[PDB]
Amino acid sequence: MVVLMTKPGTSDFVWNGIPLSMELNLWNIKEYSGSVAMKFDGEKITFDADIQNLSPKEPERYVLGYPEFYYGYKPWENHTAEGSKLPVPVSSMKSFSVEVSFDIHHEPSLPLNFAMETWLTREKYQTEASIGDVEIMVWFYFNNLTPGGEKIEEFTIPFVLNGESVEGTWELWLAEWGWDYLAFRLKCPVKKGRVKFDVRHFLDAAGKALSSSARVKDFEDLYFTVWEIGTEFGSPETKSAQFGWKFENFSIDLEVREHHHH
Amino acid sequence: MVVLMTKPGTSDFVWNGIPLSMELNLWNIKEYSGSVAMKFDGEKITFDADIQNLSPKEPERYVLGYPEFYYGYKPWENHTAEGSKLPVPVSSMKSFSVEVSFDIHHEPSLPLNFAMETWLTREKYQTEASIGDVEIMVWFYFNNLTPGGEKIEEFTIPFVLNGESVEGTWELWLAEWGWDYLAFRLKCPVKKGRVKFDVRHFLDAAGKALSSSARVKDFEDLYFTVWEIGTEFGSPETKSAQFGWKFENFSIDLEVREHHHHHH
Numbered sequence A: 001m002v003v004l005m006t007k008p009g010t011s012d013f014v015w016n017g018i019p020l021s022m023e024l025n026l027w028n029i030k031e032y033s034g035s036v037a038m039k040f041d042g043e044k045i046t047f048d049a050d051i052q053n054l055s056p057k058e059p060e061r062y063v064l065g066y067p068e069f070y071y072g073y074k075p076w077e078n079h080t081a082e083g084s085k086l087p088v089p090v091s092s093m094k095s096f097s098v099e100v101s102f103d104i105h106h107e108p109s110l111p112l113n114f115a116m117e118t119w120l121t122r123e124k125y126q127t128e129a130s131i132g133d134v135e136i137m138v139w140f141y142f143n144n145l146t147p148g149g150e151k152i153e154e155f156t157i158p159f160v161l162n163g164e165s166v167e168g169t170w171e172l173w174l175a176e177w178g179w180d181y182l183a184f185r186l187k188c189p190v191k192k193g194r195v196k197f198d199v200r201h202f203l204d205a206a207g208k209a210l211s212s213s214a215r216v217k218d219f220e221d222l223y224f225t226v227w228e229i230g231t232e233f234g235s236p237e238t239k240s241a242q243f244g245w246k247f248e249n250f251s252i253d254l255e256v257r258e259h260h261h262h
Numbered sequence B: 001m002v003v004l005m006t007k008p009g010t011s012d013f014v015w016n017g018i019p020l021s022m023e024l025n026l027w028n029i030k031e032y033s034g035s036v037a038m039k040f041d042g043e044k045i046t047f048d049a050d051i052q053n054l055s056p057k058e059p060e061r062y063v064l065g066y067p068e069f070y071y072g073y074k075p076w077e078n079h080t081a082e083g084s085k086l087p088v089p090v091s092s093m094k095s096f097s098v099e100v101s102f103d104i105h106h107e108p109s110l111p112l113n114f115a116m117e118t119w120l121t122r123e124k125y126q127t128e129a130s131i132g133d134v135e136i137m138v139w140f141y142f143n144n145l146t147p148g149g150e151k152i153e154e155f156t157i158p159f160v161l162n163g164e165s166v167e168g169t170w171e172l173w174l175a176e177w178g179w180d181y182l183a184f185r186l187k188c189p190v191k192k193g194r195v196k197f198d199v200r201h202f203l204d205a206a207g208k209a210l211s212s213s214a215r216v217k218d219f220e221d222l223y224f225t226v227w228e229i230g231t232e233f234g235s236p237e238t239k240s241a242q243f244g245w246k247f248e249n250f251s252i253d254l255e256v257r258e259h260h261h262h263h264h
């Protein structure tokens, strides 16, 4: 299964029996010159960009794009690969373990992160996120890039790094924009390696942080729609972007609480 | 050569052609029960503690002990293993690279660090440290423990981590006690791995930080007496300690400055 993209768009693929979507996502790019290439070869997914003459569509949104791949339904795209077990309500999720090997390369000054995210929505199949909805980001890497909003808390969350169980300190950045923006940023970023973690830990911390919010009142009743894996890049000042990534050894294990458990 | 200790004290040993001293150091423990064991087997050095009924000698000093090994002369113990190249004046040191593989294990609540250190003295073989002398610690790991004094600066200092060159951010903690206490703490602690770094880089940052000191007058003229490698542990509320460590693949490389003979 060789799936290749050289311009913005979305393609579905199957990796280790998991149905997924790849998105060469340049959402906030107005214009550009150069090259972009996304490829899935059956064993791995890679992305490379060597783009110039950049301008943002909306300078206030800061980042330029998010080349990624995802499991589940992405609301902003009205899209899901066939056979995905997502969306599921947050209350029915016992655990959601994600495993991936990664390598991030970039031109040194480039604002960039290695971020994973979900959209928590009131309705199962929304086409946007608004007041009452949540965007939860998990940053494993960052370079000359700070999350949006303000740092409100710090959480200790375990994960497996290169087969070793480690306790990470995750900064929580909150913003009350069109929707609720929550970004958990690892204090000690990792550019390459293999990580294994349970998304449930980030859902617990986010529910606890939103426990006094007048906007997100029924946290556990929201639908966990997707799990996106990619790199946000750029700033309103970025005119040239040279970077890429490689993802390998990918696996997801979703545990849903049902009547036969216990 | 097998070196084994099961109570506080010192023993000399030779590792990969390097003369060293091991110290089962419980310096601030007034009393204890349970087991302590330090061992060198030719290839590695290990320590294990399963101690209870702990009480400090001086509660104000906070930590309970520092089981360690060292290269050179430790002033407080008036001791050196035969054949060490230290003490040397700081000005003479071009480079002092240290390499070690380490694994620290401990009960989760235990106050503990993986800290390396030197004592910078005015005279070559002092028996203690006082005003004008410096204590410089390098913390690669910490658990439920903060260095003494206050955070006065942050420094970018490179090191090799698991064969990859990295640039650590180190907090500098400074305290004006009986001597000057300086502690460089890695913002991103590592309890297991392989590290290679140059002590000269920490001395350069310690020299800058102490540039306008009324106590420390001439940094480069002081003697670099020792390089201690161990784990500080405990607190005045610590009643029992369960932890251990293992150190392997140890090497040091001292590069001294060359002299040019003047005829006057």
Ligand SMILES: [Br-]
Pocket (backbone or CB within 6 Å): A004, A005, A006, A007, A009
């Ligand atoms: Br295409």
Ligand SMILES: [Br-]
Pocket (backbone or CB within 6 Å): A105, A106, A107, A242, A243, A244
């Ligand atoms: Br690059």
Ligand SMILES: [Br-]
Pocket (backbone or CB within 6 Å): A167, A168, A169, A170, A186, A187, A188
């Ligand atoms: Br961390």
Ligand SMILES: [Br-]
Pocket (backbone or CB within 6 Å): A096, A097, A098, A196, A197, A198
């Ligand atoms: Br997991």
Ligand SMILES: [Br-]
Pocket (backbone or CB within 6 Å): B105, B106, B107, B242, B243, B244
């Ligand atoms: Br233990």
Ligand SMILES: [Br-]
Pocket (backbone or CB within 6 Å): B167, B168, B169, B170, B186, B187, B188
């Ligand atoms: Br660091």
Ligand SMILES: [Br-]
Pocket (backbone or CB within 6 Å): B158, B159, B160, B196, B197, B198
């Ligand atoms: Br180095």
